[PDB]
Design a binder for this molecule. Structure first.
Ligand SMILES: O=C(O)CCN1C(=O)[C@@H]2Cc3c(n(Cc4ccc(F)cc4)c4ccccc34)CN2C1=O
Ligand SMILES: O=C(O)CCN1C(=O)[C@@H]2Cc3c(n(Cc4ccc(F)cc4)c4ccccc34)CN2C1=O
Ligand SMILES: *[C@@H]1O[C@H](CO)[C@@H](O[C@@H]2O[C@H](CO)[C@@H](O)[C@H](O)[C@H]2NC(C)=O)[C@H](O)[C@H]1NC(C)=O
Ligand SMILES: [Ca+2]
Ligand code: NA
Ligand code: NA
Ligand SMILES: [Zn+2]
Ligand SMILES: [Zn+2]
Length: 750
């Protein structure tokens, strides 16, 4: 029996909340623990009360002490007020009763709560509105790809991309075992979640999981109940979860009028939470995070592309369907199965095609969706509002699309003593929360993909002091060291010189129009920096040796002549040179990089047309460009070990991508090279591909397609730091936490 052991935190008859899922509860759990009687609200008559065990909650004078009161008791029978009726009072300091070592954290998570419901629900969710308004909040929070529940909830809790924590979807095929696994035990998965991190550091955690038949009102009383327990038992961190509004969203669509009740209902539970805390004097002591795993889009049966309309033998493939596609051979010894053919077959075959196929390594890097062996090589990015099935109602809403999509954005509100008061912060990525939650609990966070510091502007106190990483390889500064005859060939640095964070050998090179860091190992620049202010020739096939760099560690024009696939281009573009004299610097062999003919069309468009437009538009730009090597698609700078391809019969490694970081003043009335304030930045990581299969209008003028591809491969600065092992923005006039925020920014074009 459960006697009074009920909802306990720890062979026998079981009393914990998760027992009902494992069907291991004692026969009397439904009698003692899950009482439903009289409802979840007091009334005038209920007050002055027999502390009747039969009830769900009590309105007796006993009530307050035992810690099992109905959440609106004070409001109804001691004259006090609903917390939503009070005016925002700032909380300059945690107001906890004696013997609390720290402010409790309550994570209030909701499935499928799209960011728009905040504007178009103000009227119907007043308690949530009061959290938003009095607390700290962002316009939206960005989930991770894929925008599905389990992958997002576990990232939330761990700080890791799905590729790394391992929950890449609900069914996953492991080719090591040739078996499929259907999704819960935290422990077999990657990363350290929050409830563990806290436990290992002597901070007691409550459950982050509930048995679905336990109704929401009971879960709240349970948390308030636990909060009255004594110091040696009481947990410091708790978690509520709601399947709504995701559940109704699938059924009715995010804009269905049927959505209105479910949000009101979620708001009621958030009401009980606050009314309950308040009547335990804990409403200015606990920190609450109201947070969402992802959003919801309109998607119906009739918007469904079918693979059988593209592929000869569709019974030879296995497809995970829906708002993303994952394709895999169904049969093990099938020599008829050809990934290159499949992708070709699925590539721009209709003008209005509602998905695009990709091998995972060609997916835009911002998705971080490749480095896991249960991610099938062939992936389909599905257009928003659409589905993908194998071959030929329930639903009008779904999610799982590209996480830059708006319908997929989600919410974050931070209320409490440690959060700023009435503050609006910019949108961030949910991988950043794990680090913040550790901060609120005094924990050293486990290694994750967050960037610790980048969210210090959300917090009143408890900010941790991030430190710039150390240069690992100091630069060389060659002077004029060689003769033209030794060779057998054929202001611009506004934010600090970036710092090389791995062991290598590089020369820093200066020119009038640009500054560069040249790797004597990779035979090209690691980075090329140049400012262009707001305000040609027939030398195409000439290159000059750089006299500051030995011919051993320079590229040559023989390799590029004898490579019928590969060509070369410049990181600093000759077109932007400041004078006929200076133009010769842009043609130094130290400025060449390997570039497929197809990539040049993108790259020339960019250097010739978009940079000067960007400069006009933003009042100057600083531009840092370099190559990236990521052949193992793990999002990190490759070692020489990992390089698969080279320019014909040479040591010149071919980059898998090319980055650029484009930087200006937030105050566009000050030019780029004379800021006094915050910075503005947008970056991208363009894949380096022999063809333009990815862009459906590549046969047209670059004005009609290059800029669309670029928007698609937008990237955070931080992404490029991981992929290049550099560190940018080391010598600005801004604080290091502000700069971390700048670096986590991704410029979405929506
Ligand atoms: O070291 C190695 O490579 C193999 C060793 N090994 C393990 O001992 C655990 C066992 C286990 C794992 N998972 C997660 C998983 C999910 C989908 C899959 F297709 C494969 C695994 C589980 C989930 C439920 C119950 C047990 C497990 C992952 N493990 C290993 O890979
Ligand atoms: O109560 C219900 O309506 C259904 C029971 N249920 C769930 O379906 C989800 C599944 C899930 C939960 N968590 C923990 C969590 C909670 C809040 C966060 F901000 C982050 C993580 C997960 C972690 C990884 C993967 C799956 C999950 C919580 N759930 C339930 O109790
Ligand atoms: C995301 O975070 C994880 C954890 O910090 C990084 O993964 C670790 O990588 C190291 C070195 O490659 C391995 O030895 C560890 O086993 C990895 N840990 C886990 C839990 O997977 C990962 O590199 C980060 N990803 C990016 C793109 O920055
Ligand atoms: Ca790599
Ligand atoms: Na060539
Ligand atoms: Na094309
Ligand atoms: Zn969800
Ligand atoms: Zn869903």
């Amino acid at each position: 029996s459960c006697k009074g052991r009920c909802f306990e935190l720890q062979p026998d008859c079981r009393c914990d909340n998760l027992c009902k899922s494992y069907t291991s509860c004692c026969h009397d759990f439904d009698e003692l623990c899950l009482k439903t009687a009289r409802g979840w609200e007091c009334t005038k008559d209920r007050c002055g009360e027999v502390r009747n065990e039969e009830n769900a909650c009590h309105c007796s004078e006993d009530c307050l002490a035992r810690g099992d009161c109905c959440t609106n008791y004070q409001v109804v029978c001691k004259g006090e007020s609903h917390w939503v009726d009070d005016d925002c009072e700032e909380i300059k300091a945690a107001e906890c009763p004696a013997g609390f070592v720290r402010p409790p954290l309550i994570i209030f998570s909701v499935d499928g709560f799209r960011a728009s419901y905040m504007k178009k629900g103000s009227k119907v969710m007043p308690n949530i509105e009061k959290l938003r308004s009095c607390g700290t909040h962002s316009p939206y929070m960005r989930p991770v790809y894929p925008t599905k529940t389990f992958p997002n909830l576990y990232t939330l809790a761990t700080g890791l991309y799905p590729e790394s924590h391992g929950i890449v979807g609900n069914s996953m095929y492991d080719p090591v075992f040739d078996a499929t696994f259907h999704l819960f035990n935290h422990r077999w998965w990657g990363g350290q979640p929050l409830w563990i991190t806290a436990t290992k550091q002597g901070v007691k955690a409550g459950t982050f999981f509930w048995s679905v038949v336990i109704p929401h009102e009971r879960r709240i009383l349970t948390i308030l109940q636990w909060l009255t327990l004594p110091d040696h038992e009481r947990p410091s961190v708790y978690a509520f979860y709601s399947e709504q509004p995701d559940f109704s969203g699938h059924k009715y669509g995010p804009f269905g009028p049927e959505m209105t009740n479910p949000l009101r209902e979620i708001d009621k539970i958030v009401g009980q939470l606050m009314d309950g805390l308040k009547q335990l004097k804990l409403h200015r002591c606990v920190n609450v995070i109201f947070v969402g795993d992802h959003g919801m889009e309109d998607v119906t049966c009739d918007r469904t592309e079918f693979l059988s309309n593209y592929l000869t033998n569709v019974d030879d493939i296995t497809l995970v369907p829906g708002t993303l596609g994952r394709i895999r051979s169904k049969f093990s010894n099938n020599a008829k199965y050809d990934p290159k053919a499949i992708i070709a077959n699925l590539t721009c075959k209709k003008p209005d095609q509602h998905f695009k196929p990709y091998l995972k390594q060609h997916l835009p890097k911002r998705l971080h969706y490749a480095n896991n062996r249960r991610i099938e090589d062939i992936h389909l990015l599905v257009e928003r509002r659409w589905h993908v099935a194998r071959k030929p109602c329930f639903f009008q809403g779904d999610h799982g699309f590209d996480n830059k999509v708006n319908s997929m954005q989600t919410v974050f509100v931070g209320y409490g003593s440690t959060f700023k008061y009435k503050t609006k912060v910019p949108p961030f990525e949910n991988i950043e929360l794990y680090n913040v939650m550790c901060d609120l609990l005094g924990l050293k966070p486990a290694p994750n993909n967050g960037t610790h510091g980048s969210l210090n502007h959300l917090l009143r106190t408890n900010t941790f002091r991030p430190t710039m990483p150390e240069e690992v390889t100091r630069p060389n500064y060659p002077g004029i060291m060689y003769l033209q005859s030794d060779f057998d060939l054929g202001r611009h640095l506004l934010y600090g010189r970036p710092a090389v964070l791995y062991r290598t050998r590089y020369d820093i090179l200066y020119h009038t129009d640009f500054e560069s860091g040249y790797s004597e190992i990779f035979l090209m620049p690691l980075w090329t920096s140049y400012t262009v202010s707001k305000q040609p020739d027939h030398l195409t096939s000439c290159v000059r040796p750089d006299v500051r760099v030995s011919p051993s560690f320079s590229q040559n024009c023989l390799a590029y002549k004898n490579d019928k696939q590969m060509s070369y281009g410049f990181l600093f573009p000759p077109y932007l040179s400041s004078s006929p004299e200076a133009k010769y610097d842009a043609f130094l062999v130290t400025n060449m990089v390997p570039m497929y003919p197809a990539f040049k069309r993108v790259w020339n468009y960019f250097q010739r047309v978009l940079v000067k437009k960007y400069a006009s538009e933003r009042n100057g730009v600083n531009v840092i460009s370099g190559p990236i090597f990521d052949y193992d698609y793990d999002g990190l700078h490759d070692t020489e070990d990992k390089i698969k391809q080279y320019v014909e019969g040479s040591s010149i490694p071919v980059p898998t991508h090319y980055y650029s970081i484009i930087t200006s003043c937030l105050d566009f009335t000050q030019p780029a090279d004379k800021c006094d304030g915050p910075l503005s930045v947008s970056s991208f990581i363009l894949p380096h591909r022999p063809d333009n299969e990815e862009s459906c209008n590549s046969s047209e003028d670059e004005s009609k397609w290059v800029e669309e591809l670029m928007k698609m491969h937008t990237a955070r600065v931080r992404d490029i730091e991981h992929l290049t092992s550099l560190d940018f923005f080391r010598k600005t006039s801004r604080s290091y936490p502000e700069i971390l925020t700048l670096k986590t920014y991704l410029h979405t074009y929506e």
